[PDB]
Amino acid sequence: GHMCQVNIKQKMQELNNEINMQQTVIYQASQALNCCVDEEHGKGSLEEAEAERLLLIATGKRTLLIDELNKLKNEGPQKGSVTLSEIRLPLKADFVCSTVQKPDAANYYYLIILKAGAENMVATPLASTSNSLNGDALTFTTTFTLQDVSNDFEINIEVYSLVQKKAVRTSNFALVGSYTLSLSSVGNTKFVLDKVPFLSSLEGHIYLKIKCQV
């Protein structure tokens, strides 16, 4: 049981405020990352990686809000569900071996961003080969459930990788793959990632379970 918006201004204001909140997070994650001048001050730590993740998330969310708001301001005069789960990201065996044979060279973190609507974005926690690897793939705890959804739904998956070796800024998490799930993806469990960087750690597929009710 939910109340409908009173007017278009209230919605715009809500979006506007959320944009400003996200910018605060961006600014603060930036200020924290700027303090990471050395290992004594947190450089190359997990804490730093988490800050990079938050910067990424707030940046991405802010972008969706901006687009929605621009959409609202250009409007003219005035059921089903999809569930994603058991996400798995297979890595190349040779990459993994390098982390074993040269474990002090770098730290590697991965995450997944799931975006459907503009107010519909979720990011998995950080995953690493140290704590998420089953077989040759990273396992994610994350379940993503989309309600009151139409049959032309799209869910954008973005895979990010962070490499740590040995004024507002941009997250060091880099986009290492993307895929758009739609109705035609239903019943499938293995998808070919687009935009995978030349010579990346990713095997190039992503695995997941899609439940769907209409």
Do residues 148 and 121 both lie within one domain? yes
Domain limits for position 185: 79-165+171-214
C-alpha distances in angstroms, 173 versus 14, 74, 76? 28, 33, 38
- Residue linked to tokens 């758009």: 180
Residues 7 and 94 in one domain: no
Please indicate the experimental technique that yielded this structure.
X-ray
Q: What residues have CB less than 8 Å from 65, skipping those under 6 apart?
A: 15, 18, 19, 22, 118, 119
Together in a domain, 32 and 70: yes
Which of 43, 62, 78 terminates a domain? The answer is: 78
Which positions ≥6 away from 54 have C-beta within 8 Å?
25, 29
Q: Tally the domains of the chain.
A: 2
* Positive or negative torsion for Cα 35, 103, 126, 184: positive
Judge if 112 and 186 occupy the same domain: yes
Write the CB contacts of 102 (distance below 8 Å, at least 6 apart in sequence): none
